[PDB]
């Protein structure tokens, strides 16, 4: 029996191109160029899936810092105080507190200052 | 010469950008005051044959 390509390859190319929707020029229109693009994309996702955790933590730290200097201390000092006080609310919530619940954040600054 | 050549295929975007100046300008026309038909100005009206008020031409 002879097993010609037949239907199979077209189906694989369709798979790829559908993933390449939205891409520029031949990157969304040509299987070859699409595939190349998609490799790049895949590694970027992985790498950026990682840096997202970095990208946010850096943001929180910048925000907490700003709210700290409003009460007359810096981020480094603040965090040491919390450590000394045994407060373990993370920087995700610390920032949300720093914006939405400034009184509560103020109290945390008190505790921090006392723990030094 | 040494036979210059396109280095890369021009993209659909770039060839069409080049043609952003390629549209035809419509013919400028005015009514012929005799027969009200539309014709280019400063030409003898090809419908009634009048120009400058008089019959000039057998149409």
């Amino acid at each position: 029996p002879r097993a010609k390509t037949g239907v199979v390859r077209r189906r694989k190319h369709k798979k790829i191109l559908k993933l390449a929707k939205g891409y520029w020029g031949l990157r969304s229109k040509s299987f070859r160029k699409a595939r190349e693009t998609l490799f790049a994309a895949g590694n970027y996702a992985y790498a950026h899936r990682k840096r997202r955790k970095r990208d946010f933590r850096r943001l929180w730290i910048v925000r907490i810092n700003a709210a700290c200097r409003q009460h007359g201390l810096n981020y480094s000092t603040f965090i040491h105080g919390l450590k000394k006080a045994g407060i373990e609310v993370d920087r995700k919530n610390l920032a949300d507190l720093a914006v939405r619940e400034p009184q509560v954040f103020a109290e945390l600054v008190e505790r921090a200052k006392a723990a030094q | 010469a040494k036979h210059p050549v396109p280095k890369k295929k021009t993209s659909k975007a770039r060839r069409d950008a080049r043609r952003s100046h390629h549209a035809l300008t419509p013919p400028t026309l005015v009514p012929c005051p005799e027969c009200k038909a539309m014709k280019p100005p400063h030409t003898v009206c090809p419908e009634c044959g009048y120009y400058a008020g008089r019959k000039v031409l057998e149409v």
Partner: protein, 118 residues
């Protein structure tokens, strides 16, 4: 450059260009009205006007002058005897040019009529 130069070249060398105006003159003077391209038309005016002015003179000299371009005694007789008198009082402007409204199909050339005046 072309600073203050008078005379179209009409994409012809010296002798062809000369021949061109002459043949036009023969045809204008013959049929009273011809159709050409606008540029030849505008350029034909003065060439013919001059010839009509000489006809307005009438002398043997001016006849022999016109013959240099027109070359046809009968055509010139028509020029001197029938044409020139119509212009006895007219001071130049023995010709007019009016542009037609449609171009040639095969090459898109804009057309004009050139006629002798009333």
């Amino acid at each position: 450059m072309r600073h203050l130069k008078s005379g179209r070249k009409l994409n012809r060398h010296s002798s062809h260009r000369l021949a061109l105006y002459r043949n036009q003159a023969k045809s204008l003077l013959t049929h009273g009205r011809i159709t050409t391209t606008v540029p030849k038309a505008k350029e034909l005016r003065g060439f013919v006007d001059h010839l009509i002015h000489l006809a307005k003179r009438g002398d043997l000299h001016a006849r022999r002058l016109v013959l240099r371009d027109l070359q046809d005694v009968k055509l010139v007789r028509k020029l001197f005897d029938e044409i020139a008198p119509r212009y006895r009082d007219r001071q130049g402007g023995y010709t007019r040019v009016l542009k037609l409204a449609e171009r040639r199909r095969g090459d898109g050339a804009p057309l004009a009529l050139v006629e002798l005046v009333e």
